[PDB]
Design a protein around this ligand. Structure first.
Ligand code: PLM
Ligand code: CL
Length: 135
């Protein structure tokens, strides 16, 4: 008995964001960029072709896209142009992404709560919560 991330598949629209400014600060994002980041209301599209999962983020300010297999480290360029070594895992219904770069670490845990996808973003004790609804 192995679970899957099929429940994450689809198109997701940001409906709420809490503490994103301080999470961006902790990541090293500069003020002008945080201002635009805070105003962004992205769409996130999670798809899967065979073993390969893709997470595409679309906003006016920044589009990003990563493609990966579960549990295999990949190189990632983030929305704020960090170049990280990343791994996405599935832990008891939660799709967990860890990004490491320059001896630093941040985690984005995405889980489903009453049909909404909730992304918890952590960097050195700063926690940001972002809520998405399925389109
Ligand atoms: C497209 C996202 C907002 C744009 C702001 C760019 C500068 C900082 C963003 C980097 C961290 C993004 C983490 C998003 C987590 C998520 O909700 O999927
Ligand atoms: Cl397929």
């Amino acid at each position: 008995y192995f679970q899957s991330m099929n429940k994450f598949l689809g198109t997701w629209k940001l409906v709420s964001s809490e503490n994103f400014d301080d999470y961006m600060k902790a990541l090293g994002v500069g003020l002008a960029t945080r201002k635009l980041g805070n105003l962004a209301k992205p769409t996130v599209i999670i798809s899967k072709k065979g073993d390969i999962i893709t997470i595409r983020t679309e906003s006016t300010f920044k589009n990003t896209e990563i493609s990966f297999k579960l549990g295999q480290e990949f190189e990632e360029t983030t929305a704020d142009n960090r170049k990280t070594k990343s791994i996405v895992t599935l832990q008891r219904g939660s799709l967990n992404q860890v990004q490491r770069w320059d001896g630093k670490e941040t985690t984005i845990k995405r889980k489903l709560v009453n049909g909404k996808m909730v992304a918890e973003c952590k960097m050195k004790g700063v926690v940001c919560t972002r809520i998405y609804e399925k389109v």
